[PDB]
Amino acid sequence: VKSISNQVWKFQRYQLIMTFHERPVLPPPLIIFSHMTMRDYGLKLFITDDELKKVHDFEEQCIEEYFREKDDRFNSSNDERIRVTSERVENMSM
Amino acid sequence: LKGANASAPDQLSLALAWNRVDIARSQIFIYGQQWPVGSLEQAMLDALVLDRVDFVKLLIENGVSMHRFLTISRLEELYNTRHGPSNTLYHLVRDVKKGNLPPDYRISLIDI
Amino acid sequence: ISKHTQLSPTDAFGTIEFQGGGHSNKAMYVRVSFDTKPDLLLHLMTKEWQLELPKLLISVHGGLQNFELQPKLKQVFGKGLIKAAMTTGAWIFTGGVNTGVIRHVGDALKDHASKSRGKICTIGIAPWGIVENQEDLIGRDVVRPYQTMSNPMSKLTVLNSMHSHFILADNGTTGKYGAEVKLRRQLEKHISLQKINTRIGQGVPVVALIVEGGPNVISIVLEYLRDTPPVPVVVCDGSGRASDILAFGHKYSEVTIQKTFTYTRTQAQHLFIILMECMKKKELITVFRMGSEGHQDIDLAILTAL
């Protein structure tokens, strides 16, 4: 229950931040005037072409590193080494 | 493979039908090979229709560029194919189109 | 006409991305004449391309004819070349086009890229008149996609991918070779004269690697041996071409029957004077064999010669 509650609270921070971003400056008791009167950040981030290319290159490098690290971890596991050793020993014996 | 003295496209078609990518790698894509113009794109289309990931990868490794290959008509053909595992696309298209689809209706990119 | 061509400022340089292979590789290129002074090229490489001076300079030569060599030897060759280039800080000089030995070094780069994240500075110096798509490269300081796939019908060849940089040599002729060799040799000699970070007073070491080859490879190795600072030459015995005649002449020498090769105009023509002048300085020659030689690795053989 504690772990699930922590995860749900962390998830629900986002809606609180959005709600207080989309709200008037004044509080309810004195937004009476503001009712009759009626995103550079906080929601998005507008980027230029050169910085967009930089972000794309960074993402490509990250995904390449992720795949390389995953392959390196898999190839050096005990199970894979045992399997390969057994196959090579069988072929060598034959 | 050598039993017909056929062109490399037909050997590639046979290897695609048999789903043996090692044979095509070791017997069809060899040093000094000759390829006609536009045959590899047709091979890529056939491999995409039949859901042959290994053959798609091998064709990409051998000079096929997806930027030049993919057009609107090819994508519409890919969406209107039958040579693959069953999916639930037609039900969604019927639901979005208010269930007024005539028989053998052709799906357009607008519907997608 | 003795190169009746004008001299206009450079029109084709920038960056290219290769489309068609299984990799995503970017290469920097410039189209320049064959009279460019090596100091200007060094300035371009060290400042515009931002390349640190190398501690080693491998200059691979061979036969431009698209050949094939025995398996279990191309793997050893690739492993040794990649290890020698990666462990040290080295620049590799090749032809650049995708034919012959350059195709094999491209394969060696390709198989190593999957297993390791190291970056190797491979520099291709090719004539401008043989690139299959001379267009699609004119965009100054802008990326230009390039098609790795080629049709065998055209006599032109495509620049090999997996090369980090390109220098395109121009003289005025198109569809002809022999317009980049002098610039390559002059740049190599100029780089060798540069002072490495050590304060002993020694310059950058230069070694030459030979695979396959032909008639002009003998002249190249002669000019390397006859250079004012001698350049060690590593030869591969199992290649088959005139490198193999060098390997054979390296054995039980200081027998003209074994010297006869029939390779160039049968027994009527013999490059015997050139071969014997090369074999006079057999201490700088390091023939690599996978058998009796103590150095079974080309990587160990390359560094030991220096």
Short mmCIF file of all heavy atoms in Angstrom, two decimals, chain C residues 126-183:
data_model
loop_
_atom_site.label_atom_id
_atom_site.label_comp_id
_atom_site.label_asym_id
_atom_site.label_seq_id
_atom_site.Cartn_x
_atom_site.Cartn_y
_atom_site.Cartn_z
N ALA C 126 40.97 10.39 -52.62
CA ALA C 126 40.59 9.83 -53.91
C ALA C 126 40.50 10.93 -54.95
O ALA C 126 40.23 12.09 -54.61
CB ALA C 126 39.24 9.10 -53.82
N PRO C 127 40.72 10.61 -56.22
CA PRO C 127 40.50 11.60 -57.27
C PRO C 127 39.03 11.95 -57.41
O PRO C 127 38.14 11.13 -57.17
CB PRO C 127 41.03 10.91 -58.53
CG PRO C 127 40.97 9.46 -58.22
CD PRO C 127 41.24 9.34 -56.76
N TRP C 128 38.77 13.20 -57.79
CA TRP C 128 37.41 13.69 -57.93
C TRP C 128 36.71 13.14 -59.16
O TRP C 128 35.47 13.10 -59.19
CB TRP C 128 37.43 15.22 -57.94
CG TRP C 128 36.18 15.87 -58.46
CD1 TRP C 128 35.97 16.35 -59.72
CD2 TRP C 128 34.98 16.14 -57.72
NE1 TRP C 128 34.71 16.89 -59.82
CE2 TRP C 128 34.09 16.77 -58.60
CE3 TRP C 128 34.58 15.90 -56.41
CZ2 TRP C 128 32.81 17.17 -58.21
CZ3 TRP C 128 33.31 16.29 -56.02
CH2 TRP C 128 32.45 16.92 -56.92
N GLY C 129 37.46 12.71 -60.17
CA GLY C 129 36.88 12.29 -61.43
C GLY C 129 36.30 10.89 -61.47
O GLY C 129 35.77 10.50 -62.51
N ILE C 130 36.38 10.13 -60.38
CA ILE C 130 35.88 8.76 -60.36
C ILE C 130 34.69 8.58 -59.44
O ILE C 130 34.10 7.48 -59.43
CB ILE C 130 37.00 7.77 -59.98
CG1 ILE C 130 38.33 8.22 -60.58
CG2 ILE C 130 36.70 6.37 -60.50
CD1 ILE C 130 38.38 8.08 -62.08
N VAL C 131 34.30 9.60 -58.68
CA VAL C 131 33.12 9.48 -57.83
C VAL C 131 31.88 9.36 -58.71
O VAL C 131 31.69 10.15 -59.64
CB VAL C 131 33.02 10.68 -56.87
CG1 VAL C 131 31.93 10.44 -55.85
CG2 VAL C 131 34.36 10.91 -56.19
N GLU C 132 31.04 8.36 -58.41
CA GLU C 132 29.93 8.04 -59.31
C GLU C 132 28.95 9.21 -59.41
O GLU C 132 28.46 9.51 -60.50
CB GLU C 132 29.22 6.78 -58.83
CG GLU C 132 28.70 5.91 -59.96
CD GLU C 132 28.02 4.65 -59.47
OE1 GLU C 132 27.33 4.71 -58.43
OE2 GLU C 132 28.18 3.59 -60.11
N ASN C 133 28.66 9.86 -58.29
CA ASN C 133 27.78 11.02 -58.26
C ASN C 133 28.63 12.24 -57.91
O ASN C 133 28.78 12.58 -56.74
CB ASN C 133 26.63 10.83 -57.27
CG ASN C 133 25.85 9.56 -57.51
OD1 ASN C 133 25.68 8.74 -56.61
ND2 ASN C 133 25.37 9.39 -58.74
N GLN C 134 29.21 12.87 -58.93
CA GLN C 134 29.93 14.12 -58.69
C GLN C 134 28.98 15.21 -58.23
O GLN C 134 29.32 16.01 -57.35
CB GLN C 134 30.69 14.54 -59.95
CG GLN C 134 31.81 13.60 -60.33
CD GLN C 134 32.58 14.07 -61.54
OE1 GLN C 134 32.51 15.25 -61.91
NE2 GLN C 134 33.30 13.16 -62.18
N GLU C 135 27.78 15.26 -58.81
CA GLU C 135 26.70 16.05 -58.24
C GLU C 135 26.29 15.44 -56.90
O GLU C 135 26.86 14.45 -56.44
CB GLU C 135 25.52 16.11 -59.21
CG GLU C 135 24.88 14.77 -59.53
CD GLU C 135 25.64 13.98 -60.58
OE1 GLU C 135 26.64 14.51 -61.11
OE2 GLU C 135 25.23 12.84 -60.87
N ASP C 136 25.29 16.04 -56.27
CA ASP C 136 24.85 15.67 -54.92
C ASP C 136 25.95 15.89 -53.89
O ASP C 136 25.83 15.42 -52.75
CB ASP C 136 24.34 14.22 -54.87
CG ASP C 136 23.38 13.98 -53.73
OD1 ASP C 136 23.10 14.93 -52.96
OD2 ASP C 136 22.89 12.84 -53.60
N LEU C 137 27.02 16.58 -54.27
CA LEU C 137 28.11 16.91 -53.37
C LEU C 137 28.50 18.38 -53.44
O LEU C 137 29.40 18.80 -52.70
CB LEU C 137 29.35 16.05 -53.67
CG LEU C 137 29.20 14.53 -53.65
CD1 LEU C 137 30.48 13.87 -54.13
CD2 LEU C 137 28.86 14.05 -52.25
N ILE C 138 27.85 19.16 -54.30
CA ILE C 138 28.28 20.54 -54.53
C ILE C 138 27.83 21.48 -53.42
O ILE C 138 28.38 22.58 -53.29
CB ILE C 138 27.75 21.03 -55.90
CG1 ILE C 138 27.88 19.92 -56.94
CG2 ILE C 138 28.52 22.25 -56.36
CD1 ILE C 138 29.31 19.54 -57.25
N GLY C 139 26.84 21.09 -52.62
CA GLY C 139 26.34 21.95 -51.57
C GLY C 139 27.40 22.36 -50.56
O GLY C 139 27.87 21.52 -49.78
N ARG C 140 27.78 23.63 -50.57
CA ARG C 140 28.81 24.12 -49.66
C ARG C 140 28.28 24.18 -48.23
O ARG C 140 27.27 24.83 -47.96
CB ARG C 140 29.29 25.50 -50.09
CG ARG C 140 29.85 25.55 -51.50
CD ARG C 140 30.32 26.95 -51.85
NE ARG C 140 30.75 27.06 -53.24
CZ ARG C 140 31.05 28.20 -53.84
NH1 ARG C 140 30.97 29.36 -53.21
NH2 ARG C 140 31.43 28.19 -55.12
N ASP C 141 28.99 23.51 -47.32
CA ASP C 141 28.70 23.55 -45.89
C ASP C 141 27.26 23.13 -45.58
O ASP C 141 26.57 23.75 -44.77
CB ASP C 141 28.99 24.94 -45.32
CG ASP C 141 30.45 25.31 -45.40
OD1 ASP C 141 31.30 24.46 -45.06
OD2 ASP C 141 30.76 26.44 -45.82
N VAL C 142 26.81 22.07 -46.23
CA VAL C 142 25.47 21.54 -46.01
C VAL C 142 25.50 20.03 -46.22
O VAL C 142 26.21 19.53 -47.10
CB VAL C 142 24.43 22.23 -46.92
CG1 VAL C 142 24.77 22.01 -48.38
CG2 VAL C 142 23.02 21.76 -46.60
N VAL C 143 24.72 19.31 -45.41
CA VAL C 143 24.67 17.86 -45.49
C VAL C 143 24.03 17.44 -46.81
O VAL C 143 23.05 18.05 -47.26
CB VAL C 143 23.90 17.29 -44.29
CG1 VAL C 143 24.10 15.79 -44.19
CG2 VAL C 143 24.33 17.99 -43.01
N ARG C 144 24.58 16.40 -47.42
CA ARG C 144 24.09 15.88 -48.69
C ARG C 144 23.99 14.37 -48.60
O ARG C 144 25.02 13.69 -48.41
CB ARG C 144 25.00 16.30 -49.85
CG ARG C 144 25.13 17.81 -50.04
CD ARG C 144 23.81 18.43 -50.46
NE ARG C 144 23.43 18.04 -51.82
CZ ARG C 144 23.54 18.83 -52.88
NH1 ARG C 144 24.00 20.07 -52.77
NH2 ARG C 144 23.19 18.37 -54.07
N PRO C 145 22.80 13.78 -48.72
CA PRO C 145 22.68 12.32 -48.67
C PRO C 145 23.36 11.67 -49.86
O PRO C 145 23.42 12.22 -50.96
CB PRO C 145 21.17 12.08 -48.69
CG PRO C 145 20.61 13.30 -49.34
CD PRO C 145 21.49 14.44 -48.91
N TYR C 146 23.87 10.46 -49.63
CA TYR C 146 24.63 9.73 -50.64
C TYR C 146 24.15 8.28 -50.67
O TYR C 146 23.87 7.69 -49.62
CB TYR C 146 26.13 9.79 -50.35
CG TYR C 146 27.02 9.42 -51.51
CD1 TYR C 146 27.27 10.34 -52.52
CD2 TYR C 146 27.61 8.17 -51.60
CE1 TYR C 146 28.08 10.01 -53.59
CE2 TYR C 146 28.42 7.84 -52.66
CZ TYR C 146 28.65 8.76 -53.65
OH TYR C 146 29.46 8.43 -54.72
N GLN C 147 24.06 7.72 -51.87
CA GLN C 147 23.54 6.37 -52.07
C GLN C 147 24.70 5.38 -52.13
O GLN C 147 25.52 5.43 -53.05
CB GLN C 147 22.71 6.29 -53.35
CG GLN C 147 21.61 7.33 -53.44
CD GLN C 147 20.63 7.26 -52.28
OE1 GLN C 147 20.29 8.28 -51.69
NE2 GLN C 147 20.19 6.06 -51.95
N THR C 148 24.77 4.48 -51.14
CA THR C 148 25.84 3.49 -51.13
C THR C 148 25.66 2.45 -52.23
O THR C 148 26.65 1.94 -52.77
CB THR C 148 25.91 2.79 -49.77
OG1 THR C 148 24.72 2.02 -49.57
CG2 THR C 148 26.03 3.82 -48.66
N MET C 149 24.42 2.13 -52.58
CA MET C 149 24.17 1.18 -53.66
C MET C 149 24.67 1.74 -54.99
O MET C 149 24.49 2.93 -55.29
CB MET C 149 22.68 0.85 -53.76
CG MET C 149 22.36 -0.24 -54.78
SD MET C 149 20.71 -0.09 -55.50
CE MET C 149 19.67 -0.42 -54.09
N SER C 150 25.30 0.88 -55.79
CA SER C 150 25.80 1.28 -57.09
C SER C 150 25.44 0.21 -58.11
O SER C 150 25.30 -0.97 -57.78
CB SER C 150 27.32 1.49 -57.07
OG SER C 150 27.81 1.79 -58.37
N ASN C 151 25.31 0.63 -59.36
CA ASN C 151 25.11 -0.38 -60.39
C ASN C 151 26.44 -0.70 -61.08
O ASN C 151 27.23 0.21 -61.36
CB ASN C 151 24.10 0.09 -61.44
CG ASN C 151 24.54 1.36 -62.15
OD1 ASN C 151 25.10 1.31 -63.24
ND2 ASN C 151 24.28 2.50 -61.53
N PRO C 152 26.71 -1.98 -61.33
CA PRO C 152 28.00 -2.35 -61.94
C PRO C 152 28.18 -1.83 -63.35
O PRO C 152 29.31 -1.86 -63.86
CB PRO C 152 27.97 -3.89 -61.92
CG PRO C 152 26.94 -4.24 -60.88
CD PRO C 152 25.91 -3.16 -60.96
N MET C 153 27.12 -1.35 -64.01
CA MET C 153 27.23 -0.90 -65.39
C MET C 153 28.18 0.29 -65.51
O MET C 153 29.00 0.34 -66.43
CB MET C 153 25.85 -0.54 -65.93
CG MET C 153 24.86 -1.70 -65.92
SD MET C 153 25.36 -3.04 -67.01
CE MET C 153 25.39 -2.20 -68.59
N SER C 154 28.07 1.26 -64.60
CA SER C 154 28.90 2.45 -64.67
C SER C 154 30.34 2.13 -64.28
O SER C 154 30.59 1.35 -63.35
CB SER C 154 28.34 3.54 -63.77
OG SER C 154 29.10 4.73 -63.89
N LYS C 155 31.29 2.73 -65.00
CA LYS C 155 32.70 2.52 -64.71
C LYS C 155 33.17 3.31 -63.49
O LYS C 155 34.22 2.98 -62.93
CB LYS C 155 33.55 2.88 -65.92
CG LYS C 155 33.47 4.34 -66.34
CD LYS C 155 34.29 4.59 -67.59
CE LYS C 155 34.29 6.07 -67.97
NZ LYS C 155 34.93 6.91 -66.92
N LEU C 156 32.43 4.33 -63.08
CA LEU C 156 32.77 5.07 -61.88
C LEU C 156 32.45 4.24 -60.64
O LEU C 156 31.65 3.30 -60.68
CB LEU C 156 32.03 6.40 -61.83
CG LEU C 156 32.22 7.34 -63.02
CD1 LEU C 156 31.55 8.67 -62.76
CD2 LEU C 156 33.70 7.54 -63.33
N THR C 157 33.09 4.60 -59.53
CA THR C 157 32.91 3.89 -58.27
C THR C 157 32.46 4.86 -57.19
O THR C 157 32.65 6.08 -57.29
CB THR C 157 34.19 3.18 -57.85
OG1 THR C 157 34.05 2.68 -56.52
CG2 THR C 157 35.37 4.13 -57.90
N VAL C 158 31.87 4.31 -56.13
CA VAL C 158 31.30 5.09 -55.05
C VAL C 158 32.31 5.19 -53.91
O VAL C 158 33.10 4.26 -53.67
CB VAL C 158 29.97 4.48 -54.55
CG1 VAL C 158 28.93 4.54 -55.65
CG2 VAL C 158 30.18 3.05 -54.09
N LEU C 159 32.30 6.32 -53.22
CA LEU C 159 33.12 6.48 -52.03
C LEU C 159 32.69 5.48 -50.97
O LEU C 159 31.50 5.34 -50.68
CB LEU C 159 33.01 7.90 -51.49
CG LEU C 159 33.44 9.03 -52.42
CD1 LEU C 159 33.19 10.38 -51.77
CD2 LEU C 159 34.90 8.88 -52.80
N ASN C 160 33.66 4.78 -50.39
CA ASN C 160 33.35 3.79 -49.37
C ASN C 160 32.83 4.48 -48.11
O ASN C 160 33.43 5.44 -47.63
CB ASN C 160 34.59 2.96 -49.05
CG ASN C 160 34.33 1.91 -47.99
OD1 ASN C 160 33.20 1.46 -47.80
ND2 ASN C 160 35.38 1.52 -47.28
N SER C 161 31.72 3.98 -47.59
CA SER C 161 31.25 4.41 -46.29
C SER C 161 32.22 3.93 -45.21
O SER C 161 33.24 3.31 -45.49
CB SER C 161 29.83 3.91 -46.04
OG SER C 161 29.75 2.51 -46.21
N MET C 162 31.90 4.25 -43.96
CA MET C 162 32.71 3.96 -42.78
C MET C 162 34.01 4.76 -42.75
O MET C 162 34.76 4.66 -41.77
CB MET C 162 33.05 2.46 -42.64
CG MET C 162 31.85 1.53 -42.78
SD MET C 162 30.54 1.85 -41.58
CE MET C 162 31.42 1.61 -40.04
N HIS C 163 34.30 5.55 -43.78
CA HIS C 163 35.44 6.46 -43.77
C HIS C 163 35.03 7.76 -43.07
O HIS C 163 33.95 8.29 -43.34
CB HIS C 163 35.92 6.76 -45.18
CG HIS C 163 36.88 5.74 -45.72
ND1 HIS C 163 36.64 4.39 -45.66
CD2 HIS C 163 38.08 5.88 -46.34
CE1 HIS C 163 37.65 3.74 -46.21
NE2 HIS C 163 38.54 4.62 -46.63
N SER C 164 35.89 8.25 -42.19
CA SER C 164 35.56 9.43 -41.41
C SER C 164 35.64 10.71 -42.24
O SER C 164 34.77 11.58 -42.13
CB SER C 164 36.48 9.54 -40.20
OG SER C 164 36.34 8.41 -39.35
N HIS C 165 36.66 10.83 -43.09
CA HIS C 165 36.89 12.06 -43.84
C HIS C 165 37.29 11.71 -45.26
O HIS C 165 37.73 10.60 -45.55
CB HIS C 165 37.97 12.93 -43.18
CG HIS C 165 37.64 13.35 -41.78
ND1 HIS C 165 37.75 12.49 -40.71
CD2 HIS C 165 37.20 14.52 -41.28
CE1 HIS C 165 37.40 13.13 -39.60
NE2 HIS C 165 37.06 14.36 -39.93
N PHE C 166 37.14 12.70 -46.15
CA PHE C 166 37.52 12.54 -47.55
C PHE C 166 38.21 13.81 -48.04
O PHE C 166 37.81 14.92 -47.68
CB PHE C 166 36.30 12.25 -48.43
CG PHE C 166 35.79 10.85 -48.32
CD1 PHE C 166 34.69 10.55 -47.54
CD2 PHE C 166 36.41 9.82 -49.01
CE1 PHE C 166 34.22 9.26 -47.44
CE2 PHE C 166 35.95 8.53 -48.92
CZ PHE C 166 34.85 8.25 -48.13
N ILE C 167 39.24 13.62 -48.85
CA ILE C 167 39.89 14.70 -49.58
C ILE C 167 39.87 14.32 -51.05
O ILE C 167 40.47 13.31 -51.44
CB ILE C 167 41.33 14.96 -49.10
CG1 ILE C 167 41.33 15.56 -47.70
CG2 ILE C 167 42.05 15.88 -50.06
CD1 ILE C 167 41.44 14.53 -46.60
N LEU C 168 39.18 15.12 -51.86
CA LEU C 168 38.98 14.81 -53.27
C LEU C 168 39.96 15.63 -54.10
O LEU C 168 39.93 16.87 -54.06
CB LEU C 168 37.54 15.10 -53.69
CG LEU C 168 36.44 14.20 -53.11
CD1 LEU C 168 36.89 12.75 -53.04
CD2 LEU C 168 35.98 14.69 -51.74
N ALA C 169 40.82 14.94 -54.84
CA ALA C 169 41.86 15.59 -55.62
C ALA C 169 41.37 15.85 -57.04
O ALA C 169 40.82 14.95 -57.69
CB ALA C 169 43.13 14.74 -55.65
N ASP C 170 41.57 17.07 -57.52
CA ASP C 170 41.11 17.49 -58.83
C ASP C 170 42.29 17.98 -59.65
O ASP C 170 43.18 18.67 -59.13
CB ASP C 170 40.05 18.60 -58.71
CG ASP C 170 39.27 18.81 -59.99
OD1 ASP C 170 39.83 18.63 -61.08
OD2 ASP C 170 38.07 19.16 -59.90
N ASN C 171 42.31 17.62 -60.93
CA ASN C 171 43.33 18.12 -61.85
C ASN C 171 42.67 18.77 -63.06
O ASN C 171 43.21 19.71 -63.63
CB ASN C 171 44.25 16.98 -62.28
CG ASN C 171 43.50 15.75 -62.73
OD1 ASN C 171 42.36 15.52 -62.32
ND2 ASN C 171 44.13 14.95 -63.59
N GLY C 172 41.49 18.27 -63.43
CA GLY C 172 40.78 18.76 -64.59
C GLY C 172 40.19 17.63 -65.41
O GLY C 172 39.09 17.77 -65.96
N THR C 173 40.90 16.51 -65.48
CA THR C 173 40.39 15.35 -66.19
C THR C 173 39.30 14.67 -65.37
O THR C 173 39.24 14.79 -64.14
CB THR C 173 41.51 14.34 -66.47
OG1 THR C 173 41.94 13.75 -65.24
CG2 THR C 173 42.69 15.03 -67.14
N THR C 174 38.41 13.97 -66.07
CA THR C 174 37.33 13.23 -65.44
C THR C 174 37.36 11.79 -65.92
O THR C 174 37.77 11.50 -67.05
CB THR C 174 35.96 13.86 -65.75
OG1 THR C 174 35.69 13.77 -67.15
CG2 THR C 174 35.93 15.32 -65.32
N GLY C 175 36.93 10.88 -65.05
CA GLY C 175 36.94 9.47 -65.39
C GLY C 175 38.31 8.83 -65.44
O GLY C 175 38.43 7.70 -65.92
N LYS C 176 39.35 9.52 -64.97
CA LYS C 176 40.72 9.04 -65.01
C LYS C 176 41.32 9.03 -63.62
O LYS C 176 40.96 9.85 -62.76
CB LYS C 176 41.58 9.89 -65.94
CG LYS C 176 41.07 9.98 -67.37
CD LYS C 176 41.99 10.82 -68.23
CE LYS C 176 41.53 10.86 -69.67
NZ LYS C 176 41.46 9.49 -70.26
N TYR C 177 42.25 8.11 -63.39
CA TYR C 177 42.93 7.96 -62.12
C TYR C 177 44.21 8.80 -62.11
O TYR C 177 44.41 9.69 -62.95
CB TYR C 177 43.24 6.49 -61.85
CG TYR C 177 42.27 5.81 -60.91
CD1 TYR C 177 41.45 4.79 -61.36
CD2 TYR C 177 42.21 6.17 -59.58
CE1 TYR C 177 40.57 4.16 -60.50
CE2 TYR C 177 41.34 5.54 -58.71
CZ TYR C 177 40.52 4.54 -59.18
OH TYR C 177 39.65 3.91 -58.32
N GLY C 178 45.08 8.54 -61.14
CA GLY C 178 46.40 9.14 -61.10
C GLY C 178 46.42 10.64 -60.87
O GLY C 178 47.24 11.34 -61.47
N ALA C 179 45.55 11.14 -59.99
CA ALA C 179 45.49 12.57 -59.71
C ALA C 179 45.58 12.88 -58.22
O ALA C 179 45.36 14.04 -57.83
CB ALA C 179 44.21 13.18 -60.29
N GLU C 180 45.89 11.89 -57.38
CA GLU C 180 45.93 12.09 -55.94
C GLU C 180 47.16 11.48 -55.28
O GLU C 180 47.35 11.69 -54.07
CB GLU C 180 44.68 11.50 -55.28
CG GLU C 180 44.75 10.00 -54.98
CD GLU C 180 44.71 9.11 -56.22
OE1 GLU C 180 44.91 9.61 -57.35
OE2 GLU C 180 44.49 7.89 -56.05
N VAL C 181 47.99 10.74 -56.01
CA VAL C 181 49.10 10.02 -55.39
C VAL C 181 50.16 10.99 -54.88
O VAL C 181 50.67 10.85 -53.76
CB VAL C 181 49.68 9.00 -56.39
CG1 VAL C 181 48.72 7.84 -56.56
CG2 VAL C 181 49.95 9.65 -57.73
N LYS C 182 50.52 11.99 -55.69
CA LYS C 182 51.57 12.92 -55.29
C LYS C 182 51.16 13.73 -54.08
O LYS C 182 51.97 13.95 -53.17
CB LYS C 182 51.93 13.84 -56.46
CG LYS C 182 53.26 14.53 -56.32
CD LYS C 182 53.58 15.37 -57.54
CE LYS C 182 53.42 14.57 -58.82
NZ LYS C 182 54.26 13.34 -58.82
N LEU C 183 49.91 14.19 -54.04
CA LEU C 183 49.42 14.94 -52.89
C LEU C 183 49.43 14.08 -51.64
O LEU C 183 49.81 14.55 -50.55
CB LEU C 183 48.02 15.48 -53.17
CG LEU C 183 47.38 16.40 -52.12
CD1 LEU C 183 46.61 17.51 -52.80
CD2 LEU C 183 46.46 15.61 -51.20
#
